[PDB]
């Protein structure tokens, strides 16, 4: 469970992200795909992209980055009281998109890295640890739903 002080660190940096949701979403997805190419293969929508320049040029990838970060921002702003938001996300991710929990770990690392690059003054070690806790809570709760459905592994 995050403390109130930890949530304030998380949401303080997240308010900075929302100034340029789309640029963050591009950086995060591109980092994810570069660092962990097995993740790109899960997207029929994106798997034609073969270079970082092609990824950066894709408007559809930019659009999806906004979809992803909007859903995550709505979850973070619930400060843990996010059941209604995770149900459908866990359902689609386990049963339709077939995304292992480990890949959620990967994108969590990408999110932390991009926040650090873009917001160093609001993403010192205290805020990095708090955001890591928030993303762990997200993964923990999604993993419980995956396990319910027979997908935790
Ligand atoms: C912070 C973590 C993530 C969030 C908040 C998120 C959010 C979303 C949302 C809101 C959608 C559209 C609605 C839906 O299908 O549920 C979606 C679609 C999808 N996501 Fe996730 N996602 C995350 C992580 C991942 C990861 C790590 C992968 C793959 C490695 C992935 C793969 C997909 C795929 C394949 C789709 C369908 C894309 C399409 O063809 O339209 N997601 N995601």
Ligand 1: distance of its center to the CA of 93 in Å?
7
Protein residue whose Cα sits closest to atom 17 of ligand 1? 68
Torsion from C-alpha of 121, 126, 130, 136, nearest 10 degrees = 110
Q: Is residue 132 a contact partner of residue 6, using CB atoms and an 8 Å limit?
A: no
Pick from 71, 76, 131, 146 the residue to mutate for probing ligand 1's pocket: most ligand atoms within 8 Å of its CB.
Answer: 71
The structure's method of determination equals X-ray
113 labelled binding-site residue: no
116 labelled binding-site residue: no
SS (H, E, C) 42-107: CCCCCCCCCCHHHHHHCHHHHHHHHHHHHHHHHHHCCCCCCHHHHHHHHHHHHHHCCCCHHHHHHH
Distances in Å between the Cα of 105 and the Cα atoms of 17, 50, 131, 138, 139 are 20, 23, 13, 10, 7
Structure tokens at 20: 């340029």
Distances in Å between the Cα of 59 and the Cα atoms of 73, 101, 141 are 21, 27, 31
Span 1-153 CATH architecture: Orthogonal Bundle (1.10)
Handedness of CA 62, 48, 27, 78 (dihedral sign): positive
The residues near 98 (Cβ < 8 Å, ≥ 6 apart) are 42
Give the distance from CA 141 to its chain's centroid: 14
Pick from 14, 33, 97 the residue to mutate for probing ligand 1's pocket: most ligand atoms within 8 Å of its CB.
Answer: 97
């Amino acid at each position: 469970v995050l403390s109130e002080g930890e949530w304030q660190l998380v949401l303080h940096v997240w308010a900075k992200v929302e100034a340029d949701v789309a640029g963050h979403g591009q950086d995060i997805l591109i980092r994810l795909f570069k660092s962990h190419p097995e993740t790109l293969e899960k997207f029929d929508r994106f798997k034609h992209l073969k270079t970082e320049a092609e990824m950066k040029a894709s408007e559809d990838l930019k659009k999806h980055g906004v979809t992803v970060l909007t859903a995550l921002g709505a979850i973070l702003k619930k400060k843990g009281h996010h059941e209604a938001e995770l149900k459908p996300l866990a359902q689609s991710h386990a049963t339709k998109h077939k995304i292992p929990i480990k890949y959620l770990e990967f994108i969590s690392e990408a999110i932390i890295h991009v926040l650090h690059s873009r917001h160093p003054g609001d993403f010192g070690a205290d805020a990095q640890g708090a955001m890591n806790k928030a993303l762990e809570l997200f993964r923990k709760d999604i993993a419980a739903k995956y396990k319910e459905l027979g997908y935790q592994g």
